[PDB]
Every structure is written in C-alpha cells, then in structure tokens.
C-alpha cells in the first residue's frame, strides 16, 4: 500500500528479511563453473503516519568513502531499489533513504559474483549392483558452519528413463522415486553443517543433480544491516527487526 | 567487560615462507535473537573513561593487530560491530570517527593512543571530514 497520511498502528515496527539465493554450477570434474549470490531485502512495514527511513549496511563503497575501508564490508553489485528509494542520495553518498509503503515489499536486490565453496556438496558414484541391476552410491556433505542447519533440503538425482524397481537405503532422511521426472529425490528435513550423509539406491534395467535448501540465521555474503533509522514527526517509538535467510535458487552439480 | 579488559590488555601489549591459505566452513551465521549494533556515543564515552581509569591504552603504540584485538573483544563481549574504531587519515594526529571515543592517535608514522576528553564534545573528525558523515 502506497502510504497515504494517517496510517496508524498500535505498535510501530519494521521487519526486514535479508534473503540470499545461491546459484551454483559445478562440472562433472568438480570444477565450479559459476557461483553467485542473488540477494534481496524484503520489508514488512508497520509504521504510523509518514516516516522517513535510512538503511545502514556494511556496504563496501560506503565504508571506503566514509573512512571505514579498513573495516569488513560487502561489495554489492547490480543493486536495484524499490521506487521509494531516493536514487540521488544513494548515488551521491550511498545513503539508502526512503519513505516506505505500508505493508510488504522488496526494498532492494543485489548480486555478488563471489566464489566460496558450495554449501552443499554432492558426490554420486554409479556401480553395477547385480545383473542388469545398477547401483547409485551418493554422498552429501554440508560445508557450512556446524552451528548452522539447512532445512528441507532436497537432492534431485536424475536416473535413467528406463530404470525400474528402485530399492533404497539411507543413513538419514528419505528417498523416493519420481519416474515422471525420471529422477530420484533425497529429502532431508534438517541437515546440520559439517555433516556427511550417505544414500544408496539401485534399480533394475544427463541433467545435473540439483539441490534445494534453506538455511535460516545465516548469510553467505556476510551482509549486515547495521541500523535502520526511522524519523517521524511525532517522534515516536519505532522498532526495526531483522533476519537473514539463505536458500538455493539455482544450484546444480553436473554428473558428466 | 570489567574482568575482560586486563586479559585483553595484555594480549594487546604482546602484539608487536607462505601465507597458510585459509579454509572455510562457508557463511555467516547469525545468533538468532542477540542484537548487534554500532557503537553508541555514551558507550564510547564510558569505555574511553573506563580504559583511561584502568590504564593500559594510553601511550600504547598503535598497530592494526592491537586495535583488532580491542574491537573484537568489544564485539564479542558487547555486540558492537567492530567498524567503530576508525581514525582520520594522517599524517598528523588521527582523530576518531566515532563521536564519543575519547582516544586518538598521535605520532611519537609511529602513532600512539592518547586520551583526550575534548573529543567527547568536539567531533573533530567531522570537521576535518564532513563527507564521512
């Protein structure tokens, strides 16, 4: 909602959600072909009246220009702003300044073409199980911090169109066969960092492996909202809240 | 804080082939509800005085290492983003960018930490570099 005057809330608050999607392309050989973070900040704004907001991030260009280059920042690329943001201010001195809409919306979006390890690594080895029975041994490892946990991770493993009679055995999570998509999907409700899990599958008798996941309480880029300033004419009590979610986006490992 | 400083004070005194390429567990976890914020005037002032009172920083020769020890200590023990202890570029005296921080770096460029209460009132760095603000 475009904020007309005299919006009113019992409690003046903002919630920000820093969401980062990870794009990843690995080769059969394990060579990271491409690797990229696509991030955005969603705001849910519950603010009375007609406030003026200023968003403080560990933006590198800002730090470099404000004598804070020695400090750890994040180099934002292809930044794009919701229309409420005053581009001139951002252009001039990197200020993020805006009168917000009411309710929900995406303040900004950005990229990083940084190349850190894949959060989640898949190895899939194909052996001959019996007869024209074929076996897939697969390892999945979380390469993110032990103190963090991915949720609802799904590992999509393509199998041949003519396979049948799958049988599966896994240490953790669960597997199913999806013939329509001609693949198997290994699901893990909850996957702590610094873990290695194994699944085995065989069948009677390509696309890449892809994985879905979400890691709350966590960023890849290391972006931080330092502060959110709220200036309304009343001079009221407003509170900003923040959280950081990483998730997959386009995460593919080539088989060969 | 208080028991914390003497430990970290010594650490600071102590400070002063190939790079062992460093490895990651990827990413930056955020401890769910613990709030993190930039250093405040009052906190900067209090701390300046605390360190002044207890001694250890005054006349210590500055290095990035030694500063880092300090900033991280405050970060862990107090939740202040360690982007606050920057000083104006030299040469000459280096004035803190954080108004409230009552130390500055004076050539003895080999610099050292020097307390100066005027800095709680005269935001010099802002005079010298309004653009930073």
């Amino acid at each position: 909602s475009w904020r007309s005057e005299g919006i009113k809330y019992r409690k003046n608050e903002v919630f920000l959600d820093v969401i980062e999607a990870v794009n990843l392309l690995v080769s059969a050989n394990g060579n990271v072909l491409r690797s990229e973070i696509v991030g955005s900040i969603k705001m849910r704004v519950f603010l009375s009246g007609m406030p003026e907001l200023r968003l403080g991030l560990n933006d590198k260009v800002l730090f470099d220009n404000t004598g804070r280059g020695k400090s750890k920042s994040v180099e934002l690329e292809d930044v794009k702003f919701h229309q409420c943001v005053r581009l001139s201010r951002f252009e001039n001195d990197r200020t993020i300044s805006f009168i917000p809409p009411d309710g929900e919306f995406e303040l900004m979006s950005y990229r990083l073409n940084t190349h850190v390890k894949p959060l989640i690594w898949i190895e899939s080895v194909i052996e001959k199980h019996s007869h024209s029975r074929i076996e897939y041994m697969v390892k999945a490892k979380s390469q993110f911090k032990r103190r963090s946990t991915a949720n609802n991770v799904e590992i999509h493993i393509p199998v041949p169109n003519d396979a049948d009679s799958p049988k599966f055995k896994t240490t953790v999570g669960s597997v199913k066969w999806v013939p329509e998509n001609s693949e198997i999907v290994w699901s893990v409700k909850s996957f702590p960092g610094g873990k290695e899990y194994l699944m085995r599958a065989h069948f009677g008798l390509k696309p890449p492996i892809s994985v879905k996941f979400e890691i709350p309480y966590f960023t890849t880029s290391g972006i931080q909202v330092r502060y959110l300033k709220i200036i309304e004419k009343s001079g009221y009590q407003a509170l900003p809240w923040v959280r950081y979610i990483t998730q997959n986006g386009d995460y593919q490992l080539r088989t060969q | 804080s208080v028991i914390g400083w003497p430990a970290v004070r010594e650490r600071m005194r102590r400070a002063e082939w190939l790079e062992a390429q460093e490895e990651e567990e990827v990413g930056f976890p955020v401890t769910p509800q613990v709030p993190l914020r930039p250093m405040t005037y009052k906190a900067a002032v209090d701390l300046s005085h605390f360190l002044k009172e207890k001694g250890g920083l005054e006349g210590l020769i500055h290095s990035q290492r030694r500063q880092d020890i300090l900033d991280l200590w405050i970060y862990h023990t107090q939740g202040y983003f360690p982007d606050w202890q920057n000083y104006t570029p030299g040469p000459g005296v280096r004035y803190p960018l954080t108004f409230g921080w009552c130390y500055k770096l004076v050539p003895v460029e080999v610099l050292e930490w020097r307390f100066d209460s005027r800095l709680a009132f005269h935001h010099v760095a802002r005079e010298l570099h309004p653009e930073y603000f």
């Binding site: 403080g56 | 509800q33 709030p35 930039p38 982007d83 954080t98 930073y132 603000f133």
Partner: peptide, 12 residues
C-alpha cells in the same frame, strides 16, 4: 525469529 536492529548510525 528476528533480531532487533539499531535505530541509527551511532558510530557515524
């Protein structure tokens, strides 16, 4: 679950 954020650049 959200963390509370700062209301200004106290540090600058």
């Amino acid at each position: 679950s959200y963390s509370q954020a700062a209301g200004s650049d106290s540090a600058q």
